[PDB]
Structures are given as structure tokens and as C-alpha cells.
Design an enzyme around this catalytic site. Structure first.
Site, PDB file in Angstrom:
ATOM      1  N   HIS A   1       2.349 -12.150  -7.069  1.00  0.00           N
ATOM      2  CA  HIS A   1       1.906 -10.846  -7.484  1.00  0.00           C
ATOM      3  C   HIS A   1       2.885  -9.772  -7.046  1.00  0.00           C
ATOM      4  CE1 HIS A   1      -0.463  -7.390  -8.523  1.00  0.00           C
ATOM      5  NE2 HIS A   1      -0.333  -6.945  -7.293  1.00  0.00           N
TER       6      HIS A   1
ATOM      7  N   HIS B   1      -9.810  -7.030 -15.980  1.00  0.00           N
ATOM      8  CA  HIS B   1      -8.851  -6.082 -16.511  1.00  0.00           C
ATOM      9  C   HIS B   1      -8.888  -6.102 -18.030  1.00  0.00           C
ATOM     10  CE1 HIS B   1      -4.640  -5.112 -17.854  1.00  0.00           C
ATOM     11  NE2 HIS B   1      -5.166  -3.929 -17.500  1.00  0.00           N
TER      12      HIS B   1
ATOM     13  N   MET C   1       4.260  -4.382  -4.512  1.00  0.00           N
ATOM     14  CA  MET C   1       3.568  -5.362  -3.690  1.00  0.00           C
ATOM     15  C   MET C   1       4.387  -6.607  -3.783  1.00  0.00           C
ATOM     16  SD  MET C   1      -0.514  -5.219  -4.357  1.00  0.00           S
ATOM     17  CE  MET C   1      -1.480  -3.835  -3.718  1.00  0.00           C
TER      18      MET C   1
ATOM     19  N   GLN D   1     -13.265  -8.765 -10.626  1.00  0.00           N
ATOM     20  CA  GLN D   1     -12.443  -7.696 -11.164  1.00  0.00           C
ATOM     21  C   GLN D   1     -11.981  -8.162 -12.534  1.00  0.00           C
ATOM     22  OE1 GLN D   1      -7.814  -7.021 -10.301  1.00  0.00           O
ATOM     23  NE2 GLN D   1      -9.122  -5.663  -9.069  1.00  0.00           N
TER      24      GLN D   1
ATOM     25  N   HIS E   1       4.388  -5.654  -8.824  1.00  0.00           N
ATOM     26  CA  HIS E   1       4.153  -4.700  -9.919  1.00  0.00           C
ATOM     27  C   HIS E   1       5.378  -4.761 -10.861  1.00  0.00           C
ATOM     28  CE1 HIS E   1       1.205  -2.364  -7.178  1.00  0.00           C
ATOM     29  NE2 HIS E   1       0.782  -3.573  -7.478  1.00  0.00           N
TER      30      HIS E   1
ATOM     31  N   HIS F   1      -7.883  -9.201 -20.401  1.00  0.00           N
ATOM     32  CA  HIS F   1      -6.498  -9.572 -20.135  1.00  0.00           C
ATOM     33  C   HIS F   1      -6.374 -10.549 -18.953  1.00  0.00           C
ATOM     34  CE1 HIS F   1      -2.689  -9.081 -18.075  1.00  0.00           C
ATOM     35  NE2 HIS F   1      -2.115  -8.800 -19.257  1.00  0.00           N
ATOM     36  N   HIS F   2      -7.078 -10.271 -17.855  1.00  0.00           N
ATOM     37  CA  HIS F   2      -7.068 -11.167 -16.694  1.00  0.00           C
ATOM     38  C   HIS F   2      -8.349 -10.919 -15.896  1.00  0.00           C
ATOM     39  CE1 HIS F   2      -5.951  -8.212 -13.570  1.00  0.00           C
ATOM     40  NE2 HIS F   2      -6.616  -9.086 -12.810  1.00  0.00           N
TER      41      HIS F   2
HETATM   42  C1  LIG Z   1      -0.945  -4.418   0.163  1.00  0.00           C
HETATM   43  C2  LIG Z   1      -0.856  -5.668  -0.688  1.00  0.00           C
HETATM   44  O1  LIG Z   1       0.230  -6.219  -0.856  1.00  0.00           O
HETATM   45  N1  LIG Z   1      -1.999  -6.126  -1.201  1.00  0.00           N
HETATM   46  C3  LIG Z   1      -2.038  -7.304  -2.041  1.00  0.00           C
HETATM   47  C4  LIG Z   1      -2.280  -8.543  -1.198  1.00  0.00           C
HETATM   48  C5  LIG Z   1      -3.643  -8.682  -0.557  1.00  0.00           C
HETATM   49  C6  LIG Z   1      -4.664  -9.373  -1.211  1.00  0.00           C
HETATM   50  C7  LIG Z   1      -5.844  -9.724  -0.557  1.00  0.00           C
HETATM   51  I1  LIG Z   1      -7.214 -10.964  -1.502  1.00  0.00           I
HETATM   52  C8  LIG Z   1      -6.029  -9.343   0.781  1.00  0.00           C
HETATM   53  O2  LIG Z   1      -7.178  -9.671   1.476  1.00  0.00           O
HETATM   54  C9  LIG Z   1      -5.031  -8.642   1.450  1.00  0.00           C
HETATM   55  I2  LIG Z   1      -5.246  -8.204   3.457  1.00  0.00           I
HETATM   56  C10 LIG Z   1      -3.849  -8.310   0.776  1.00  0.00           C
HETATM   57  C11 LIG Z   1      -3.040  -7.219  -3.188  1.00  0.00           C
HETATM   58  O3  LIG Z   1      -4.039  -6.525  -3.078  1.00  0.00           O
HETATM   59  N2  LIG Z   1      -2.743  -7.909  -4.290  1.00  0.00           N
HETATM   60  C12 LIG Z   1      -3.610  -7.912  -5.462  1.00  0.00           C
HETATM   61  C13 LIG Z   1      -3.313  -9.087  -6.384  1.00  0.00           C
HETATM   62  O4  LIG Z   1      -2.935 -10.172  -5.879  1.00  0.00           O
HETATM   63  O5  LIG Z   1      -3.433  -8.932  -7.620  1.00  0.00           O
HETATM   64 CU   LIG Z   2      -4.268  -8.209 -16.288  1.00  0.00          CU
HETATM   65 CU   LIG Z   3      -0.804  -4.927  -6.702  1.00  0.00          CU
END
Ligand SMILES: CC(=O)N[C@@H](Cc1cc(I)c(O)c(I)c1)C(=O)NCC(=O)O
Ligand SMILES: [Cu+2]
Ligand SMILES: [Cu+2]
Ligand SMILES: CC(=O)N[C@@H](Cc1cc(I)c(O)c(I)c1)C(=O)NCC(=O)O
Ligand code: NI
EC number: 1.14.17.3
Length: 310
Positions: free
Chosen positions: A198, A128, A270, A126, A200, A63-64
Site C-alpha cells: 500500500h 471504496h 504511506m 470500508q 499512494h 472499486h475495493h
Molecule cells: C500511517 C500509515 O502508514 N498507515 C497505514 C498502515 C496501517 C494500517 C493499519 I490496519 C494499522 O493498524 C496501522 I498502526 C497502520 C494505513 O492506514 N494503510 C491503509 C491501507 O493499507 O490501505
Molecule cells: Cu479502491
Molecule cells: Cu494510505
């Protein structure tokens, strides 16, 4: 994608270049919506530059995909469920591949700096897995991403400016909750060329802007429910010392019986706006973050598009 086998993950390209394949080790997703992670230590210790990325994903299931650079992956395993963590330290996102939104290439002469004394020592992938109908065969999958590395210093260095909320609370049923983020830019000029949003399930819209002399210039605006790929910016935008980066994610509490706060699970939210940029090599820094709201009142003048869905 096809597993490499006896030739390994490294393909020599010429004196100073090589492609590194970052693939799942023949995994077999059992539940739909499975999130798998794995890491690859870079093969060279000295500094190198990532100048290209080619997706190697099986269209029937993947998916991604997201690729990060970090110094301490969350697991010493062959692979692991990402919900355990991606990196112990702060991961730097380098690439995102979305099934329904074909990724855009890095401008020529632009590269991410990795390895060496201060660059990322690992790549963490990662994947998905959405549909797994193709997985009754109990076939293993080696989907991933191929990265083009060079020792040749690039004139322009790619980096990431991450804007994210940490304090947001979304009351249940609450029709509209805004998460505002703003910081003053104090480094050498950067030119934004791509952006990813990004959120949810509660996110309606995410927007980012450069504010200079009170004037708002759109960096990117997107519905976070659409594929979360890096999209090219409409027009190149420089952010210079003194400018202010402002972003807003619009959420709703509708459907939730309890409050939703910022966090890592599907029950949490988020608010992230990733701004990918390039800087002249001699002025460059690879990452910046903004987790504050320094000019709260400034949002009284935010364009209306920031509140209207896309
Ligand atoms: C707590 C949150 O909002 N986390 C997000 C943004 C994030 C991403 C990375 I790369 C970081 O190093 C940090 I510090 C924070 C998050 O994990 N987003 C996942 C995404 O973009 O899919
Ligand atoms: Cu996905
Ligand atoms: Cu997230
Ligand atoms: C000699 C050379 O650079 N050949 C390829 C680079 C390359 C090769 C493989 I095998 C990879 O998986 C990747 I990532 C990149 C080249 O010129 N590619 C052009 C391009 O498609 O951008
Ligand atoms: Ni410019």
C-alpha cells in the site's frame, strides 16, 4: 449487494458455525471515489475463528473493500466517511477485495482469532465507491463481505506482520526516494502465505524480504498502483527467530511542488507491506509491526529488483 431485510445478518451453519454478513446499510454515494465505513459488533462474546470470506460487492460501482478487526471503531454511526477514521485503536486488517484482482482463499485449517478477552470485538468494513453512474437511480447499496465464523479452535492461526514507514520525506521533484524498513524477527516461526502493498500515487515499487545469513529471500514485490489485494506468495516462506525482515518502497517527488511526508491524505504518502502469515496455534500471536530500520547498511545488498518497477 442485495440487502438482507427481515432475516438479518446472521446465518446459522451448524452447531458451531455461522456466516455474518457485513454490508453497507443501503448507502448512496454522491461523489465518485467515496470511501464509506461501517462496523458490526461480533454477535458472540467468546473467542471465535474467521475461517473464510466471500465478497458481496456490486461490480458496477465498488472499486475495493477492506475488512478490519478492532475494539473501537471511529464512529458510533450507522456508517461514516472513513476519512474521519477507521478505528480509534490499531485496526488489524483481515481481508482486502480488489475489483481487478480476485482474492485468494485462506488455507484450510487456518483461521483468524477474534472475540473473547483479547480478540477483536468489532469488524469495520470500508468500501471504496469508484464509478457511480449506476447511482442516478439514487439506489442504495448493500455491498460488503460475508464472514464464516466457528468456535472450533483452528490448528493454524492467521496473523499479520505490518511493515511501515513513519519518517519518510519526499523532496519535490526528487527522482528517487527510498523508504527502508527492517526489524529482527524474535518470535516463533511464521509462514507467509499472502501479501498486500500500500502506497499512494508516488509509489513506484514495494518489496519485502526475509534475510538469513546475509541471503535475501523475496516475500513479495508489487507495483502499488496495481490493485491492492492480498496476493499469494510465490513460494511459502518461513521467518524464524534471528531472521531480519526488510522492505523498501521506491517513491518519486516528480510532479510535486512541495515535500511529501507520511500521512493519511492523498497529498501524503504511506509505505506499507502487509505480510499475512499462519503460525501453529500454540505458538501464535495475531499481529506484529515494524516501523524501524535496524540494519540500514544491510540494504547495500538488496536485490536490484527492489529498485526496478514491475
Ligand atoms: C500511517 C500509515 O502508514 N498507515 C497505514 C498502515 C496501517 C494500517 C493499519 I490496519 C494499522 O493498524 C496501522 I498502526 C497502520 C494505513 O492506514 N494503510 C491503509 C491501507 O493499507 O490501505
Ligand atoms: Cu479502491
Ligand atoms: Cu494510505
Ligand atoms: C454449512 C457451511 O459451512 N456452509 C458454507 C459456509 C458458508 C455459508 C455462507 I451462507 C457464507 O456466506 C459463508 I462466508 C460460508 C460452506 O460450506 N461454504 C463453502 C465455501 O464456499 O467455502
Ligand atoms: Ni516451512
Amino acid at each position: 449487494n442485495e440487502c438482507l431485510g427481515t432475516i438479518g445478518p446472521v446465518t446459522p451453519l451448524d452447531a458451531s458455525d455461522f456466516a455474518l454478513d457485513i454490508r453497507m446499510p443501503g448507502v448512496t454515494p454522491k461523489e465518485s471515489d467515496t470511501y464509506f465505513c461501517m462496523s458490526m459488533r461480533l454477535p458472540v462474546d467468546e473467542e471465535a475463528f474467521v475461517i473464510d470470506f466471500k465478497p458481496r460487492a456490486s461490480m458496477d460501482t465498488v472499486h475495493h473493500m477492506l475488512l478490519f478487526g478492532c475494539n473501537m471503531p471511529s464512529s458510533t454511526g450507522s456508517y461514516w466517511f472513513c476519512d474521519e477514521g477507521t478505528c480509534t485503536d490499531k485496526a488489524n486488517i483481515l481481508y482486502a477485495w480488489a475489483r481487478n484482482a480476485p482474492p485468494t482463499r485462506l488455507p484450510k485449517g487456518v483461521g483468524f482469532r477474534v472475540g473473547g478477552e483479547t480478540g477483536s470485538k468489532y469488524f469495520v468494513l470500508q468500501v471504496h465507491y469508484g464509478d457511480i453512474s449506476a447511482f442516478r437511480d439514487n439506489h442504495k447499496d448493500c455491498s460488503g463481505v460475508s464472514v464464516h465464523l466457528t468456535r472450533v479452535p483452528q490448528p493454524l492461526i492467521a496473523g499479520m506482520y505490518l511493515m511501515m514507514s513513519v519518517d519518510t520525506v519526499i523532496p519535490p521533484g526528487e527522482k528517487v526516494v527510498n523508504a527502508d524498513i527492517s526489524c529482527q524477527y524474535k518470535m516463533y516461526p511464521m509462514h507467509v502465505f499472502a501479501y498486500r502493498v500500500h502506497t499512494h500515487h508516488l509509489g513506484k515499487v514495494v518489496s519485502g524480504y526475509r534475510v538469513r545469513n546475509g541471503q535475501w529471500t523475496l516475500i513479495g514485490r508489487q507495483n502499488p498502483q496495481l490493485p491492492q489485494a492480498f496476493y499469494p506468495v510465490e513460494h511459502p516462506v518461513d521467518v524464524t527467530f534471528g531472521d531480519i525482515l526488510a522492505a523498501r518502497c521506491v517513491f518519486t517527488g516528480e510532479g510535486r511542488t512541495e515535500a511529501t511526508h507520511i500521512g493519511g491524505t492523498s497529498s501524503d504518502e504511506m509505505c506499507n507491506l502487509y505480510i499475512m502469515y499462519y503460525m501453529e496455534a500454540k505458538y501464535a500471536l495475531s499481529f506484529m509491526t515494524c516501523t524501524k530500520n535496524v540494519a540500514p547498511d544491510m540494504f547495500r545488498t538488496i536485490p536490484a529488483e527492489a529498485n526496478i518497477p514491475i
